[PDB]
Amino acid sequence: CGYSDRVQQITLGNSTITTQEAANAVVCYAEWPEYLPDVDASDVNKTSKPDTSVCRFYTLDSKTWTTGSKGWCWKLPDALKDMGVFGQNMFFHSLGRSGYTVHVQCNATKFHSGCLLVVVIPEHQLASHEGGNVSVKYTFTHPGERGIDLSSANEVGGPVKDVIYNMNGTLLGNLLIFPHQFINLRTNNTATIVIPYINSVPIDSMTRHNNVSLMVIPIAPLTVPTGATPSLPITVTIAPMCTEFSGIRSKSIVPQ
Amino acid sequence: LASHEGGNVSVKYTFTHPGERGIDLSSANEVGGPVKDVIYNMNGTLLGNLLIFPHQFINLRTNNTATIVIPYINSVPIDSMTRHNNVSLMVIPIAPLTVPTGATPSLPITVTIAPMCTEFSGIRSKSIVPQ
Amino acid sequence: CGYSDRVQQITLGNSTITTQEAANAVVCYAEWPEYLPDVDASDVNKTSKPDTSVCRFYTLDSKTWTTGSKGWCWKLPDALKDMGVFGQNMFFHSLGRSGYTVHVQCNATKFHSGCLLVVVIPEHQLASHEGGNVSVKYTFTHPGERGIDLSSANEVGGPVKDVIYNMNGTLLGNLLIFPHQFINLRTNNTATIVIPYINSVPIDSMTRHNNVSLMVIPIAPLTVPTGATPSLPITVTIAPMCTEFSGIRSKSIVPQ
Amino acid sequence: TVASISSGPKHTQKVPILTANETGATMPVLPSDSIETRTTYMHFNGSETDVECFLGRAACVHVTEIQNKDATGIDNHREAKLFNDWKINLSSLVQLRKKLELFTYVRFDSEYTILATASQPDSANYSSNLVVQAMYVPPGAPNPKEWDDYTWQSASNPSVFFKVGDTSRFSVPYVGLASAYNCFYDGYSHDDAETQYGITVLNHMGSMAFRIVNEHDEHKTLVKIRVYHRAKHVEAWIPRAPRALPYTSIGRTNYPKNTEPVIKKRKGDIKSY
Amino acid sequence: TVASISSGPKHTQKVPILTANETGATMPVLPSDSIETRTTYMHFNGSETDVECFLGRAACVHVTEIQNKDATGIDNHREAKLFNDWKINLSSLVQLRKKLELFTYVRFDSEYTILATASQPDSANYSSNLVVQAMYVPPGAPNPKEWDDYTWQSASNPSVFFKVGDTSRFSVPYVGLASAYNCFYDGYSHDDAETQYGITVLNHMGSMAFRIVNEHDEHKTLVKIRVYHRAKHVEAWIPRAPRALPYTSIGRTNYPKNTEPVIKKRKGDIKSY
Amino acid sequence: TKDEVNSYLIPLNANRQNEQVFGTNLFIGDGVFKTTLLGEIVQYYTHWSGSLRFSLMYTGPALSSAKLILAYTPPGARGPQDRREAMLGTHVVWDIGLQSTIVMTIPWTSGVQFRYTDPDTYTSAGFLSCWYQTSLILPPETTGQVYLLSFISACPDFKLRLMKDTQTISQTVALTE
Amino acid sequence: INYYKDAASTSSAGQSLSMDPSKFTEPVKDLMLKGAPALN
Amino acid sequence: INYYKDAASTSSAGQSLSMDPSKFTEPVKDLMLKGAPALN
């Protein structure tokens, strides 16, 4: 009985991702993403299913993991609003529903040390740094493909950037309850998380609401060998999956 | 289309691909543009012979609407949509507009088009075209 | 289903070769070497088959791969003319036919970088460096076990030594059409190529003609770690296989 | 088959002669629908009107003159008429162009017939036995540069040799990249503000080079080479409005400025006969 | 036959796109293995790419000039161009040589077609009716020494007679001593320090002698004889790396010193398009 | 400047983020392909159709790691200037590990059934680019640039037609023995 | 009798005997029979 | 119909229809199936 498990590949549309140091992919709540059934539907407009034209992997700009980096946060579907036909359909339709296959990549040598916690939080409602009853402005919660850097300073009307309190008042060690995977450089170069549609409604506005928030947080800090650059590149790859759009209308207007 | 300059002159991309505002045959000719003589169909054929192509008449006495369902017409199965126009829609007044005494000597024409049985292939970064 | 493929061993006569970092052995044109059948035979003298007395592995003098080495070339059966009973039978018989199991070895550490193209060319007819209609002298085309070093300077009446033009007017990137294997130091320490008898005739003169020419050419140059010796040893091991000899006669006389 | 049916008096609430041509349909009204007729037969099949027959007879497509003379003191052998090149297209002759350009797409096998004829406008004592070489240069192959170029060896390119005064004839399968030739193309080579419209590699059959393979003599002989094309196994799609105005260029739909009227004005009013 | 199969999303521990090219095997990875595809058919058989088709069209192999003139006051009739000899080989023309030399061994039946063309560079009043004799001289047979030698009688040697301006065509079976021709030979004629490498009787098809059998006239006519070879029933073994550099001699692999670069250097860096 | 073995080695540099490795147009009868067996055989024909197999083999140290993105851009679109632009098209993310070679097949993307082997813009095949997905990380005590070897072959659905003589070799005078 | 290997070497196919002008004369969605009102 | 006595007088045999590129593309001792690890 001779075989290996570290080698797996995912092909979506015309894009293919290959791996040689992978940990078993995670499927949130053991439920694979699926189309909205007639027994749960509310809006009567027949849904547009674009299949291979939108269901493919999009690479987000790489981030640089330094020894002093606090972590990174992305909001979905906001992070894909400028990505090809998915980005246009998401603004041309009033309502949308979609699952996602998230694939995070961080490769390093056999001498490097460090561990990332890659976790998906549904309704990751952020706290403002000002406390009291202050709200987070739309422009800071919807950054797009450049995401939120938790290493940066706080901003007026912006969310809080203390990673340990998860930007919402919970501790970092408890994030393991949400679908997560670790990129331990000693064991793995890639985390993978398949997310179904998570909402209290069957289909919803894609411009006003983010269903999930992806967080990549270094737990054990980056430890490079003596004489190597104290920095490592992180690339995030996301593919919409089992996507549904409804209520076509003139292009949606958002701030900035 | 034929250029108004004759000889071997080509029609520039910008005059052949106007978008939703189309080509007005009542306007004057332009440098590097197509010819605007409607009687010669902008290509050297006479207007009375256009009836061989799928057509319909909007005779104001009988009708207010023409409708034409077009299949994909090309020598290849699928093709570039930015470099080539498969069909060209022409609306040409044959009998001139005759309004009653004291009415405005003008009538509005609205064109409505729906893509049908549409197929797309080879996704890639957004295509760049002139202007 | 638990097993490994990098470990393979070849025993021919009283010699055994073992490996732990091997790439799957190549069999030229998917045809294993075989004895001449009666339906193809021309000479009526009954053939001498020496079996285990000649069918065994002979190691050729090791070459030193430096960062500036251009490549190496050997001619068969000429390279085995001084090797035991095979070398004597090859000169005592007027005609001979033989297949070969070539095994090239170049071991290195997990920090070394470089790649060798090991390729067998049937009738590798060399070009002289003088151009025009000049012929290559017998003494330069039949060097024996020390082979041809492509890093050396050109010689009067000798072949050309530009490795990129394969010493014959073809480019190096196209040699992959001939039976070949790569010794990528990152993946492998050994190349292996089983060659059948390749000729337009059933049996032929072994002193006047070389059926195949073995070329070992570094494509990616040798990259040693900081502070290691900028040189690596290459050992070539060849075994005659499915060998036939015909027309015994007084010992053959050759130049030098 | 009956052409006209036997038909008597008509007194009905169904009126076949009244219709609405606005629908774009031309009703199949027969002579028997407007007046009373007798039974007669067609006694005709229409074989001469088949698209295979309308496009399937020979017509000249190119005419070119080539000369047997010494190449000494010449920098350009094509300008000296020692060899000549033809960009293959069927749009140089208006009689053939109008028939073929009556359809949008046409797919056919070709049959070329080449006629070479000799002439001595200058002093010559005998009729020279010249042999002409016609070489097909498909797109990508090196077009000959000299009358004695290495290209004429033709190790892979199709080539035909024949005596001047006689003829050669060879068939050619459908060579288009698409499923049918495009007689018209409302498009461009690439998405560019200055690129070529209509004329593009969609209508690029290749080139043909012509030379006299015989060596040069003491007398100059001008040879007029005439290429004739006859189509076989013809298929045509999307019938088009017929060409009315004269042409100005190959592969383009342009017409001359200040052109003469195409409608033959009547002598007298709209009531004259 | 299907070209591309219908294929949807992939989520598997078997990764067909990752391999080890170090093994010398080029994995048969298909378009369906890297992205999601639709079912389409080949609708093509590949008849124009057969080895019989790639080597089975005519190409010129030799060109030679011969003259009808009096043999009085001449010591060498071959140097006077009264008759000419050709050592039979297919390696004189690079267009044909590169195609054929792409394989190590080739076995084929030959078909020779000879084209003779006349020319009068000096004064002549009429086109002379010359008859050319092409004589095959296999190795061992006496090569003609004079234009009127006893050898031309051809009591056993194959010989063909034809009018100048016209052509002759004859088939030849496979004449090699071995089971296939050797395009390359890494060996020598004998075990000698000064003998010939590669060029040897393995590539010796024989010789062809050409003369004008007509008597000599008052006017000089130069006749250019062109030999064309077309292969039939072609078989090929051991495909080889293609020739890149220009050649320098027949039957040898030499190239010129100071040759130009064969790799077309790019304009800009390795990142430009 | 001159033909060298170095011309087959695509250079990789350590500590490069979101940058291009190599780039090329896809005229298989010209440019980098003219001297390859596939491109050289293709030049004996006028028309070509079907899918190409493009492969890369890594040669850096066994303790070295890199993640690269192979991206094919169909015709009609600009040659990509960034990985985000290239990743919008057909692509393979390659994790360099135990399997030393990646094989990305270029699917036949054309309206017309056959393309010309000779460079013609309407029958252009598109573009190929390679970019750093993560970065190249080298083990300690190791220096300089490492190399990738690039390979080309046809898929079993490849088609070629209308034979012609090649312009990759030529002669001015007949050869002699 | 054909004297060559290729279909392109053949003589013409004659005539396509089954003709139907309706696809050009009446390319209308609803079928219209002559005598009945075209419009109602 | 053949008009001569010899096989060398004949026209071409057409095409050898049964092709197999595997002897040139994968001339390896152990057979390798795509998707399974080339090496283990």
The helix, strand and coil proportions of chain G, stated in percent and rounded to the nearest 5, come to: 20, 5, 80
Cβ contacts of D262-268, under 8 Å, gap ≥ 24? D262/B46, D263/B46
Q: Where are the domains of chain H?
A: 1-40
Are the C-beta atoms of residues A143 and A75 closer than 8 Å to each other? yes
Distance CA F23, CA F34 (A): 16
The two tokens of residue D163 are 């005596």
- Which chains pack against G, by 3+ Cβ pairs within 8 A? B, D
What DSSP string runs through chain B? --BTT-TTPPPPHHHH---TT---TTSPP-TTPBP--GGGTTTTB-GGGGGGSS-----TTT-S----------SSSS--TTTB-S-------SSPP-PPTTS-S-----------S-------SPPP---
Are the C-beta atoms of residues C181 and C190 closer than 8 Å to each other? no
Task: Fold for C8-248, please state it.
Answer: Jelly Rolls (2.60.120)
The residue of chain B with its CA nearest to that of G26 is B54
What strands lie across the sheet with F115-116, from one edge to the other?
F115-116, F45-49, F159-163
Instruction: Assign residue C105 a region (left: φ > 0; alpha: ψ between -120 and 50; beta: otherwise).
Output: beta
Distance CA F114, CA B77 (A): 12
From chain G, the residues in CB contact with D51 under 8 A are: 16
Q: How far is F106 from chain E (nearest CA, A)?
A: 7
Q: How far is D125 from chain B (nearest CA, A)?
A: 45
The residue of chain F with its CA nearest to that of B81 is F76
Length of chain E: 273
Decide: C and D in contact? Rule: 3+ Cβ pairs under 8 Å.
Answer: no
From chain G, the residues in CB contact with B62 under 8 A are: 39
Per the CB < 8 Å rule, is F175 touching E91?
Answer: yes
> Would you call D242 an interface residue with chain G, using a CB distance cutoff of 8 Å?
no
Task: Please state the φ and ψ torsions of residue A64, each to the nearest 5 degrees.
Answer: -105, 115
Query: The tokens 């000419």 sit on which residue?
Result: E84
Distances (CA, A) of A11 to A183, E14, E15, E210: 22, 12, 10, 69
Per the CB < 8 Å rule, is C223 touching F62?
Answer: no
Q: Which of D110, D115, D132 is nearest to D60 (CA)?
A: D115
Candidates E11, E13, E36; nearest CB to A13: E36
Distance CA C180, CA C182 (A): 7
Using the 8-state DSSP alphabet, how is residue F85 labeled? Answer: H
Are the C-beta atoms of residues F28 and F148 closer than 8 Å to each other? no
Using the 8-state DSSP alphabet, how is residue D86 labeled? Answer: E
Q: How far is C4 from chain A (nearest CA, A)?
A: 7
The helix or strand, by DSSP H or E, that contains position A26, with its residue range, turns out to be: strand A26-27
Q: How far is F76 from chain E (nearest CA, A)?
A: 14
Using the 8-state DSSP alphabet, how is residue D193 labeled? Answer: T
User: Which residues of D, range 115-144, sit inside 8 Å of F by Cβ?
Assistant: 137-142
Candidates C173, C217, C226; nearest CB to F142: C226
Contacts of E62 (CB under 8 A, 6+ apart): E86, E92, E225, E226, E227
Mutate which: C168, C176, C212, vs E, most E CBs within 10 A = C168
Q: How far is B121 from chain A (nearest CA, A)?
A: 8
> Would you call A14 an interface residue with chain F, using a CB distance cutoff of 8 Å?
yes
Q: How far is F35 from chain A (nearest CA, A)?
A: 29
Candidates A9, A13, A52; nearest CB to E15: A9
Are the C-beta atoms of residues A204 and A123 closer than 8 Å to each other? no
> Would you call G34 an interface residue with chain D, using a CB distance cutoff of 8 Å?
yes
Distance CA F86, CA A59 (A): 10
Distance CA C12, CA C238 (A): 11
Per the CB < 8 Å rule, is E17 touching A52?
Answer: no
Distance CA A75, CA A148 (A): 9
Three-state DSSP at H34 gives strand
Per the CB < 8 Å rule, is D189 touching F121?
Answer: yes
The residue of chain H with its CA nearest to that of F156 is H21
> Would you call G11 an interface residue with chain D, using a CB distance cutoff of 8 Å?
yes
- The data reach a resolution, in angstroms, of 3.6
The residue of chain C with its CA nearest to that of F8 is C173
Task: Please state the φ and ψ torsions of residue E12, each to the nearest 5 degrees.
Answer: -140, 160
Distance CA F16, CA F135 (A): 6
Task: Please state the φ and ψ torsions of residue C60, each to the nearest 5 degrees.
Answer: -90, 150
From chain C, the residues in CB contact with E191 under 8 A are: 138, 207-208, 252-255
Candidates F73, F76, F90; nearest CB to B80: F76
The residue of chain G with its CA nearest to that of D30 is G34
Distance CA E212, CA E161 (A): 9
From chain E, the residues in CB contact with C169 under 8 A are: 243-245, 247, 253-255
Distance CA G17, CA F172 (A): 57
- Which chains pack against F, by 3+ Cβ pairs within 8 A? A, B, C, D, E, H
Per the CB < 8 Å rule, is H40 touching A2?
Answer: yes
CA D3, D8, D9, D10: dihedral to nearest 10 degrees?
-50
Decide: C and A in contact? Rule: 3+ Cβ pairs under 8 Å.
Answer: yes
Per the CB < 8 Å rule, is F99 touching H21?
Answer: no
Distance CA C92, CA C87 (A): 9
β-strand pairing of E167-172 with E232-239: unpaired
Are the C-beta atoms of residues F104 and A29 closer than 8 Å to each other? no
Per the CB < 8 Å rule, is H37 touching F99?
Answer: yes
Amino acid of residue D121:
P
Q: What domain count does chain F have?
A: 1
Q: Which of C31, A16, C231 is nearest to H27 (CA)?
A: C31
β-strand pairing of E232-239 with E103-119: antiparallel
Are the C-beta atoms of residues E39 and E5 closer than 8 Å to each other? yes
Three-state DSSP at G22 gives helix
Per the CB < 8 Å rule, is B125 touching F113?
Answer: no
Q: Which of E122, E118, E92 is nearest to E224 (CA)?
A: E118
β-strand pairing of E59-67 with E159-163: unpaired
The residue of chain D with its CA nearest to that of E96 is D155
Distance CA C216, CA A70 (A): 51
Tally Cβ neighbours within 10 Å of residue G16: 10
Cis peptide before A77 (omega within 30 of 0): yes
What DSSP string runs through chain C? ----SS-EEEEETTEEEEESSB---EEGGG----PPPTTT----SPPB--GGGTSS-EEEEEEEEETT---EEEEETGGGTTSHHHHHHHHHEEEEEEEEEEEEE----TT-EEEEEEEEEET--PPBTT-TTPPPPHHHH---TT-EETTSPP-TTPBP--GGGTTTTB-GGGGGGSSEEEEETTT-SEEEEEE----SSSSB-TTTB-SEEEEEEEEEEEEPPTTS-SEEEEEEEEEEEEEEEEEE-SPPP---
Using the 8-state DSSP alphabet, how is residue D178 labeled? Answer: S
Three-state DSSP at D44 gives coil
Instruction: Assign residue C20 a region (left: φ > 0; alpha: ψ between -120 and 50; beta: otherwise).
Output: alpha
Torsion E140-E146-E147-E151 (CA) sign: negative
The helix or strand, by DSSP H or E, that contains position D67, with its residue range, turns out to be: strand D59-67
Q: Which of E179, E201, E177 is nearest to E190 (CA)?
A: E201
Per the CB < 8 Å rule, is D215 touching E226?
Answer: no
From chain H, the residues in CB contact with A7 under 8 A are: 37
Q: How far is F172 from chain A (nearest CA, A)?
A: 49
Full residue range of the structural domain in which residue E202 is found:
1-273
From chain A, the residues in CB contact with C6 under 8 A are: none
The two tokens of residue F66 are 């890199």
Q: Where are the domains of chain C?
A: 8-248
Tally Cβ neighbours within 10 Å of residue D265: 5
Tally Cβ neighbours within 10 Å of residue D48: 9
* Spacing of C-alpha E179 from chain mean position: 19
Are the C-beta atoms of residues F106 and F75 closer than 8 Å to each other? no
From chain F, the residues in CB contact with D195 under 8 A are: 121
Mutate which: H28, H31, H32, H34, vs C, most C CBs within 10 A = H28
- Which chains pack against C, by 3+ Cβ pairs within 8 A? A, E, F, H
Three-state DSSP at A29 gives helix
- R_g (Cα) of chain H, nearest Å: 20
> Would you call E189 an interface residue with chain C, using a CB distance cutoff of 8 Å?
yes
Cis peptide before C77 (omega within 30 of 0): yes
Q: Which of A49, A59, A51 is nearest to A80 (CA)?
A: A59
What strands lie across the sheet with D83-87, from one edge to the other?
D83-87, D207-212, D131-137, D159-163
